[PDB]
Design a binder for this molecule. Structure first.
Ligand SMILES: CCCCCCCC/C=C/CCCCCCCC(=O)O[C@@H](COC(=O)CCCCCCCCCCCCCCC)COP(=O)([O-])OCC[N+](C)(C)C
Ligand SMILES: CCCCCCCC/C=C/CCCCCCCC(=O)O[C@@H](COC(=O)CCCCCCCCCCCCCCC)COP(=O)([O-])OCC[N+](C)(C)C
Ligand SMILES: CCCCCCCC/C=C/CCCCCCCC(=O)O[C@@H](COC(=O)CCCCCCCCCCCCCCC)COP(=O)([O-])OCC[N+](C)(C)C
Ligand SMILES: CCCCCCCC/C=C\CCCCCCCC(=O)O[C@@H](COC(=O)CCCCCCCCCCCCCCC)COP(=O)([O-])OCC[N+](C)(C)C
Ligand SMILES: CCCCCCCC/C=C\CCCCCCCC(=O)O[C@@H](COC(=O)CCCCCCCCCCCCCCC)COP(=O)([O-])OCC[N+](C)(C)C
Ligand SMILES: CCCCCCCC/C=C\CCCCCCCC(=O)O[C@@H](COC(=O)CCCCCCCCCCCCCCC)COP(=O)([O-])OCC[N+](C)(C)C
Ligand SMILES: CCCCCCCC/C=C\CCCCCCCC(=O)O[C@@H](COC(=O)CCCCCCCCCCCCCCC)COP(=O)([O-])OCC[N+](C)(C)C
Ligand SMILES: [Cl-]
Ligand SMILES: [Cl-]
Ligand SMILES: [Cl-]
Ligand SMILES: [Cl-]
Ligand SMILES: [K+]
Ligand SMILES: [K+]
Lengths: 472, 472
């Protein structure tokens, strides 16, 4: 049995911190402003805080022993909400595996292209490296699960040293790191980056790429049978990990916006103060014109800055090669946590014969009854999406399915509080049914703003799976 | 008590034939093709045929005496579906009143501008004439309802003479009617108009303006307490009126497309055969170039043809002034049928205290207990939408709310057949629950394609009104 720190807090902080922390935060401050990106982080934190209060209200409804994620939901609420939440959550983690390993493969491909190693084109090397790293992540999940419970504190002390490396490298003004952007903390760059640019995107198109960085909060409730006291561990670690990771996202956004310019040519300039005809806040001798795009229907033909290079946190970092290779720790820990959590929920769902034909993905081979057909189905669903070797098209799909699962959780606890269900007495201090209704309406409306036909498909599927289990 | 002809068939044919028959059919053949407009008419006929089978399945579920539209639905199915169908249907007819009288006012304004009568600008004369014609339509509904039961056969023999006037004026080739478009039935014009143009619109933007011409099919079920035998009158007249009006729409579309060109300058040409350098199917001596638009982001600066003038059926007609002033008959009959049917449903809903605060719109003043507060609320909701003095922005709203009401009817009969409701034995020969489910899914998907945020608002409102009445 684990305590609340090592069993809930470290698990949720390792699942939440993933691709977008080191790869795509600076791009989000580049597209939006500092103000709009802080509004984005606060909105995702509001959604996940309401869903964390709803999950805590489920977890404090009696039912200590014999836990899990599907078990608590399907036993506090009915099977109609429980089966649909289980199916949508299993599919969401199975598709999130692809997002994390595509981010890992993109980082490895850019590290190879900084050297001379280049086999095929850039979008085909992500398909090759992403395929090798998901058939190796599959082998760990079915043969090496014992060491993974010890390795997670190792992964967390790699990740926090990466974050501290970035934050203390921001204050060190290096003259060689100019021409890649990155001057010191400056007021001119802070005023220039305070306000949107949206060079090909929109608000709610940048939100759909941020919001996978806020998911992963049900990693503590996914192990309730391995906790000491789940009534006190699940509301503590979840709502603490949400606060810690949200504050690190806000700090990364403000710190990236206040010291890096949006565009930069990677050519140094001999001047130290440019002729007074630009006034574009680079008074340090750098003229970063002829990189802003001409028309308002094209991307910039630059190579560095906040808008362009995707890896500028390795430039800002004091020791970029090894310490800011906590990208590997973050992405592989989140992908491995999502590779073992999607067949687990699906095997727990396929043991109650709720849905007719899926009952063959429940036969756990071996001694611990690990679902091997579930692992191979998750590997197939992940490998279908790795072949879309682009993160910015995978991430709105994950955002859609996680907003659907969180909306279903919030609406199910609202409906159980409203309907006066027989076994529903949630003794949690910060649970209100109208906050859950507000969170469900907010998740559904944002899911429709992001992409309306995928939202309509997901809502029709969830309504069909509810009406099927009602009249059975 | 009425028979099935005079009580159902004439009522449904007068409610269905409305604005779009004489005003906006030729514009729909102008924007789309002949093929796409026939596909549009067949889709609207499929939706209304499935909804007519569902309404017949409700109407054959016992319950002869003491009828109405709200009564049959709320007594065969529950109050949860019945109250929401009643509210959405009351709002749909209350807003459709504005569409019919805005079409009437637009016709009267164009007839005045063909003369010298012009008080204010064109969009402000529709607001003035549309306001006078809805406070005069209100006086008939509360003081002259006795003569209206005799006047409807008069209105129908005006309307069918208008239709025959158009269809026999199509075959009469008049040389003076050229330069307004309108050559004879020609193969070149039929081949030229066979294929879309979409000069500012899209498919499903032209469908949203057509589909109010297919609504009005519940005008026979809205009077079940005044019928002789509603078990045999409501499935007969509804499904016959749908077929008759759909065939007249298909005939009008094909006949308009095969004899009128899309653009035309209203200037006659002395030539009888133009120099062979255009080949634009007007070999009759007319050169209708310099009216096609240059860029693909603007409307044509022409004045006549299928795309432009909105009143070309009065040009094709043999006697345009009096007989093709069946526009007044069609629009005023449909507006008067929707002004007496929205307070009726709403007063029947406000007598069962389902929704809390609306109970004051049920107190019928007078001897027949006509709901006067309901009439004034319908007049207010209509007059709010008449001030948007443009038909092409009113008509997608009516399309949204009627697709919502028809989707609710189809889903309610599917859900009652699936759930095995206690008093649900629909002895109708052509009712199937999967056809009703297909009609409900089709109406919901089309409602989302037309406008997604209005569809999301309507679906959230209907979901809230269902969950309110369930847990009361
Ligand atoms: C403005 C307002 C607009 C409103 C418009 C409405 C909105 C539109 C809403 C539309 C909602 C559609 C609801 C459909 C209802 C399903 C039919 C059903 O209930 O079961 C039927 C089919 O039984 C089966 O064998 C099929 C089992 C799966 C069917 C559902 C999953 C399909 C979607 C998931 C796809 C895969 C997902 C998995 C991968 C992610 C039962 O058959 P039976 O013979 O009748 O059983 C008799 C027993 N009984 C009488 C007691 C019942
Ligand atoms: C955009 C426009 C879309 C238009 C098409 C939309 C597709 C929807 C169209 C659906 C219509 C097609 C299904 C009909 C099949 C019936 C087979 C049959 O005849 O046997 C039996 C059914 O028993 C069955 O086996 C039913 C199997 C179908 C269940 C799945 C329903 C579709 C779920 C949809 C999920 C959402 C779909 C989207 C999700 C991805 C006969 O029925 P019965 O049980 O005997 O009861 C009859 C009793 N009578 C005796 C009352 C008096
Ligand atoms: C992918 C999946 C994503 C899923 C996301 C899903 C998200 C979709 C979101 C869907 C939102 C739907 C949920 C909201 C419904 C709540 C109803 C309610 O709470 O009322 C309750 C109180 O409230 C009141 O008394 C208010 C007064 C009546 C207002 C009617 C409700 C609001 C309707 C607004 C429409 C405006 C219409 C304007 C035109 C008229 C009823 O009070 P009660 O009677 O005491 O009930 C006690 C029950 N008991 C006795 C058993 C204890
Ligand atoms: C769009 C994106 C952003 C969306 C965000 C905004 C979206 C709006 C979302 C949510 C809005 C929040 C509503 C706040 C209501 C608080 C009033 C109150 O305390 O009532 C209470 C006082 O009991 C009474 O004295 C009766 C008062 C009327 C009941 C209020 C119901 C409001 C229905 C609103 C219908 C909304 C339909 C929505 C349709 C659109 C009654 O309940 P209770 O006693 O507290 O029960 C506690 C039981 N428990 C102890 C087990 C927990
Ligand atoms: C009136 C009530 C206000 C509610 C405010 C609540 C907070 C709202 C906050 C903020 C409001 C939204 C501001 C930004 C608008 C979205 C811009 C955008 O991204 O385009 C969008 C739509 O394109 C449109 O047409 C947008 C038109 C406005 C719709 C949004 C308001 C309706 C809110 C809901 C009304 C229901 C209310 C439910 C009950 C409460 C996206 O277009 P797409 O084609 O789908 O994307 C394709 C994606 N792809 C590229 C990957 C393929
Ligand atoms: C199977 C049941 C499963 C249920 C779920 C299925 C998922 C849904 C299935 C299908 C949805 C497919 C739509 C994707 C559109 C691409 C993105 C886009 O452009 O959005 C636009 C599409 O609005 C348009 O009209 C654009 C022009 C046509 C584009 C294709 C329409 C559908 C094609 C044929 C499909 C035939 C479907 C079958 C019907 C015969 C949105 O813009 P808007 O909404 O128009 O804004 C209006 C605002 N205004 C009023 C202020 C102007
Ligand atoms: C885009 C819109 C945004 C929101 C999307 C919604 C997301 C949907 C996801 C989750 C929401 C779940 C929906 C229902 C909520 C439960 C409340 C309820 O209905 O209680 C009822 C149960 O319900 C039933 O028994 C059958 C469900 C019928 C719902 C029909 C809604 C029609 C509105 C169409 C508009 C929606 C169109 C959606 C778009 C196509 C009554 O409770 P009971 O007495 O306990 O019943 C016992 C019966 N039993 C013994 C057999 C078990
Ligand atoms: Cl992430
Ligand atoms: Cl999660
Ligand atoms: Cl009409
Ligand atoms: Cl109707
Ligand atoms: K994450
Ligand atoms: K009509």
């Amino acid at each position: 049995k684990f305590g609340w720190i090592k069993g809930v807090l470290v698990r949720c902080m390792l699942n939440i911190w993933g691709v977008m922390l080191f790869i795509r935060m600076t791009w989000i401050v580049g597209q939006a402003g500092i103000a709009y990106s802080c509004i984005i982080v606060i909105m995702a934190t509001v959604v996940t805080t309401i869903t964390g209060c709803s999950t805590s209200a489920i977890a404090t409804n009696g039912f200590v022993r014999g836990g899990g994620a599907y078990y608590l939901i399907s036993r506090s609420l009915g099977p109609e909400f429980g089966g649909s939440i289980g199916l949508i959550f299993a599919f969401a983690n199975a598709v999130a595996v692809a997002m994390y390993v595509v981010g890992f493969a993109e980082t490895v491909v850019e590290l190879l292209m900084d050297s001379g190693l280049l086999m095929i084109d850039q979008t085909n090397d992500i398909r090759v490296i992403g395929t090798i790293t998901v058939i190796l992540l599959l082998g760990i999940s079915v043969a090496g699960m014992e060491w993974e419970a010890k390795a997670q504190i190792f992964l967390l002390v790699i990740l926090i040293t990466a974050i501290f490396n970035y934050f203390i490298g921001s204050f060190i003004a290096v003259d060689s790191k100019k021409k890649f952007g990155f001057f010191s903390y400056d007021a001119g760059i802070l005023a220039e980056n305070f306000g949107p640019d949206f060079r090909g995107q929109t608000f709610f198109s940048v939100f759909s790429i941020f919001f996978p960085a806020a998911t992963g909060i049900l990693a503590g409730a996914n192990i309730s049978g391995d906790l000491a006291d789940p009534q006190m561990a699940i509301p503590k670690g979840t709502l603490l990990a949400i606060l810690i990771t949200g504050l690190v996202y806000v700090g990364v956004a403000i710190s990236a916006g206040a010291c890096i310019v949006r565009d930069a040519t990677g050519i140094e300039s001999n001047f130290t103060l440019i002729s007074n005809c630009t006034d574009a806040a680079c008074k340090y001798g750098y003229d970063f014109s002829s990189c802003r795009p001409t028309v308002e229907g094209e991307v910039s033909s630059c190579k560095f800055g906040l808008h362009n290079d995707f890896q500028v946190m390795s430039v800002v970092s004091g020791f970029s090669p090894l310490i800011s290779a906590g990208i590997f720790s973050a992405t592989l820990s989140s992908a491995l946590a999502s590779l073992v959590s999607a067949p687990k929920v699906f095997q727990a769902l396929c043991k109650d014969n709720i849905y007719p034909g899926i009952a063959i993905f429940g036969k756990g081979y071996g001694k611990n009854n690990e679902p091997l057909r579930g692992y191979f189905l998750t590997f197939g669903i992940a490998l279908a999406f790795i072949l879309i070797a682009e993160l910015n098209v995978i991430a709105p799909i994950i955002s859609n399915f996680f907003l659907a699962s969180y909306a279903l959780i919030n609406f199910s606890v609202f409906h159980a509080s409203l309907a006066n269900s027989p076994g529903w007495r949630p003794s949690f201090k910060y649970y209100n049914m109208w906050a859950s209704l507000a969170g469900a309406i907010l998740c559904c409306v944002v899911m429709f703003i992001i992409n309306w036909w995928a939202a309509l498909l997901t809502n029709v599927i969830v309504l069909s799976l509810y009406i099927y289990v009602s009249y059975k």
